[PDB]
Structure 1
């Protein structure tokens, strides 16, 4: 039977979101001048002359 008072329900969710899909559209990276480009040790790659 459709017992009305026993079949209602309180659905609890949030008020507002702002769903962002892609995240690396926010940072804006740069590069130092490639003659001052540093390897894993702190001398520079292509150092020699």
Structure 2
């Protein structure tokens, strides 16, 4: 093929400046009550024989 400039010159649509994140989750801050205080769907208290 012969070469024709015009037709080979294309413009470019590119976004600009990301920052890609993996793992995710991590951003989650989470603690836990003290075991002696649990509950199931029940809501009364899992493990309740003092």
Q: TM-score range by the shorter chain?
A: 0.7 to 0.9
Please give the TM-score of this superposition, normalised by the length of structure 2: 0.84
Moved over 3 A (4+): none
**C-alpha RMSD of matched pairs (Å):** 1.0
Aligned residue pairs total: 49
Greater helix content: 2
Unaligned runs of 5+ in 2: none
Unaligned runs of 5+ in 1: none
